[PDB]
Amino acid sequence: AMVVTLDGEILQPGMPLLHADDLAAVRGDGVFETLLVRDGRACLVEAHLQRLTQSARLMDLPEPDLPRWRRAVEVATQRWVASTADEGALRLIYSRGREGGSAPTAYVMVSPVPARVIGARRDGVSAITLDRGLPADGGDAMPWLIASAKTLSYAVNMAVLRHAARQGAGDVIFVSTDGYVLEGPRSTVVIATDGPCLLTPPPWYPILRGTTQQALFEVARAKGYDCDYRALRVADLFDSQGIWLVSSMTLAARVHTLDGRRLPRTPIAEVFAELVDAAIVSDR
């Protein structure tokens, strides 16, 4: 993995970057984004910088200096592209800094795309529904839970995936306590339904806004597909024509098995993968 700080330093081999009292490690107190490097450029940089800006505000962090973030992104991207034509996993790390420090910690990291990602794009995954512990109205009633902020505090997110993995499941769909579909621990849920229309849970739910899904909605609408934000329940996933877990690095992963029920493949599954591909280069 390559590291470029916002200062402009490109980090030494094997050398540590963060002090032992950084709020990122001691408290997970920060925000982050993940981007896909494909064909010489990071995808949807501006839209991801906006969501990083939104997460930092919800976290009472200083407003991100976008020219400096763009330079670290550029430098890190080109260092990756120079070494390989392979795709790149680009992440932005933005923590509150050190305990008592006066400056946030900020750097850019590019790493290889995991082998799990290629299988998820090609074969899809099997998923189970798990209770989130939050009601669907929780986002409105409890803004202090900052459920819309993409923070560095992902311990539960990985714990949920480890739980599902032990049961033979490759991913998870979170369901609210009152039975509404929310999101995945690392993805946005999108559904295909017949009048073919695309549907995703509303963003006032205690969920993260999906940058890649939003771009998919614009490209799909332009190609004639209706797209909307709707309250979905577990029955809507089972009666759907397709379920995808949409994210920035893992672009689209169709759910071929949900709670043990094998799901049929449908013609839209072929065109769905081409819509996301056109969406993540829609800014070029």
Add this chain to the structure above:
Amino acid sequence: NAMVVTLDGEILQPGMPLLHADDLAAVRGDGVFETLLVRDGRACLVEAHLQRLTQSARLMDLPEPDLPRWRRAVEVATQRWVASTADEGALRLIYSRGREGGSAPTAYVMVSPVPARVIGARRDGVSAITLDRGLPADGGDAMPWLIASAKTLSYAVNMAVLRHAARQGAGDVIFVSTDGYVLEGPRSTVVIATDGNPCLLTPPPWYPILRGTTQQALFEVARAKGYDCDYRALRVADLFDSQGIWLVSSMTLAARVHTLDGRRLPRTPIAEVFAELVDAAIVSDR
């Protein structure tokens, strides 16, 4: 700012960075930690805190902590701290999953000064507000994937909750479940004094809450003095009818709640004797 002791026993250079940029503690908050108070030459309740760190590591699928190495690093950090100053010390154990693709967890001990907020909370108490947590009282048993009983490094929401309360002029928060049962604090355990006579009470521990090392030790000392102690389902009404409410944690030992949701709460003689009960609890193992 702070002394760092690795589990080998090596004491870090003062200004040198420790963690790689791809450590799962920073990239994912993926680890567990504990907090101990260094007081009068020794860290308080070391074994009981190592026991809970072992339990948090189990729930987080982390390798079982090597307790002999942890015990030695604690001492080394303790001895260097007491040698440098007679002040109290805030000692933390950090146990992360390691680096991305790494094969060994990252583990170190950190001792830092005690924040100025602690002395005011011990002496003057705090004002707190009740906030809905969004979890039902049955959440701990039914939903283990939420790992609510693990004390993890993913504290972003906890700090955001206090920032919200701070903007409301409140110094701390008491979480309430969706069905109206008192749960816990973002950084503390809730204990109340009530008559059956004077009895100390804490929310039921099968709840989706963190079990308190300091609260459990308080129960042992309080039971010895003849006080009744039990785990009971409490509601917001029980806090207002109580003779005292304290936020109990390992570094800030006891912070009485003198104001809850704007309503000033009466002070009762047990608040003074409570402050010496916790004091006796954190040295009850010596």
